[PDB]
Amino acid sequence: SEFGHRTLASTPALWASIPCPRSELRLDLVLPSGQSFRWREQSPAHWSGVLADQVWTLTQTEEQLHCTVYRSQASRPTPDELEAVRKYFQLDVTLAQLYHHWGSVDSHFQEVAQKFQGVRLLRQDPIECLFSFICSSNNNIARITGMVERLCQAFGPRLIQLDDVTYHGFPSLQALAGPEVEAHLRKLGLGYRARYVSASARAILEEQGGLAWLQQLRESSYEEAHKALCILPGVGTQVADCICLMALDKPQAVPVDVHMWHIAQRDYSWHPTTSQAKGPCPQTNKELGNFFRSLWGPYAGWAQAVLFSADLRQ
DNA sequence: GGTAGACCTGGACGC
DNA sequence: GCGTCCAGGTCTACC
Ligand SMILES: [Ca+2]
Ligand SMILES: [Ca+2]
């Protein structure tokens, strides 16, 4: 059937593969784990979302990542298009190599890694990432996903409709900086997060020099970027870290939330040295991050992603 | 320079 | 049925 969301079984001719063993990627451990909030499993084992300003559905077999795009006559994805997918999942970095290293220097990680393979990091767009995580604070993944959806529906470009689901592209700075955006987001249920989105959009545009400012941060240092991001309304060290790690190519940035905070205590018997605070404080959180960085190396952020993901289930 | 509440929302959760 | 607790925290007003 030419309608609704596709499935590998339903329309074989429209799918193309990317060699990728499950040990290098587990869609179900990555897509709904709080990295990106734009993917839904519309059909069992099939994930649909907007990627590179187009709609896709992904599914995998033992050794293959099957992809299908919705753009003209319906046809399988092209090599170039497939490359978009590869870049998005940063498939050039070998998860096996990282897992080996982390596992060799951390027994606990080895134990977790034995049951949660294929958890890698997505390379996300700076804008989409920055605003998605501004919506993530003092909130749960289920709700956050809804908020980002209505945000895109209300201020993003309409892409294509599958069944009764209409996909939108992520809003632009100009749209987010638009008049009365906050009031609207409020009526959309983003709570006090509403003002953050408007204020941060207006600030990057009317004070930091626009989109270029954000993108330039990808070349800047982690210390650099993190400091820069913390300027924006609604962006603290934790949100700043999420953005550095997932969108600004800072693989050593380690987001420290409640999850990573309980993980450090329960799994590593970790306690603040540079402080005596009772809960995650700006100083203790800073210290935990260094701890993890010192324990896992240059890709500590990625190691964190595996544990955060695993903790969402366990 | 460490440190207590105050938020929007809405699934649990225990009562 | 229903107040509490809490989730990928940030912001800010006393110490
Ligand atoms: Ca909390
Ligand atoms: Ca800030």
CA A284 to C1' B1 (Å) is 13
- Whether residue A245 is contained in a domain is answered as yes
A117-129: b or e for each residue (b if 16 or more CB lie within 10 Å)? bbbbbbbbbbbbb
**Residue A108 in tokens:** 């606990």
CATH number at residue A162: 1.10.340.30
Q: Using an 8 Å Cβ cutoff, are A284 and A272 in contact?
A: yes
Residue A258 and residue A109 share a domain = yes
A138 CA distance to ligand 1 middle (Å): 6
* DSSP 3-state of A208: coil
Q: Which residues contact A131 (CB under 8 A, 6 or more apart)?
A: A148, A151, A170, A171, A176, A197, A200, A201
Query: Which phi and psi angles does A132 have, rounded to 5°?
Result: -65, -50
Burial of A67 (0-12, 13-18, 19+ CB in 10 A): buried
Tell me the pairing of strands A55-60 and A46-50.
antiparallel
Residue among A243, A252, A260 at smallest CA distance from A299: A252
Contacts 24+ apart (CB under 8 A), A137-145: A137/A193, A137/A234, A137/A236, A137/A238, A137/A239, A139/A193, A141/A32, A141/A33, A141/A34, A141/A37, A141/A312, A144/A34, A144/A37, A145/A37, A145/A40
Can you say whether the dihedral through the CA atoms of A6, A9, A10, A13 is positive or negative?
positive
CATH number at residue A101: 1.10.1670.10
Give DSSP secondary structure letters for A66-103.
EEEEE-----PPPHHHHHHHHHHTTTTS-HHHHHHHHH
Q: Locate tokens 């999942």: which residue?
A: A89
Distances (CA, A) of A132 to A121, A194, A236, A267, A271: 16, 12, 14, 29, 30
CA A143 to C1' B4 (Å) is 27
Query: Which phi and psi angles does A148 have, rounded to 5°?
Result: -60, -30
- Whether residue A120 is contained in a domain is answered as no
The Cα–Cα gap between A300 and A305 comes to: 9
CATH number at residue A20: 3.30.310.40
CA angle A78, A30, A144 (to 5 degrees): 105
Residue among A161, A125, A6, A13 at smallest CA distance from A77: A13
Residue A166 and residue A61 share a domain = no
Elucidation technique = X-ray
Q: How many domains does chain A have?
A: 3
For residue A56, what are the β-bridge partners? A49, A69
Domain boundary among A222, A250, A278: A250
Q: Of the ligands numbered here, which is closest to the C-alpha atom of A232?
A: 2
Q: How many CB atoms lie within 10 A of CB A110?
A: 14
The Cα–Cα gap between A130 and A134 comes to: 6
DSSP A12: G
Q: Of the ligands numbered here, which is closest to the C-alpha atom of A227?
A: 2
- Whether residue A161 is contained in a domain is answered as yes
Declared resolution, Å: 2.6
A51 CA distance to ligand 1 middle (Å): 31
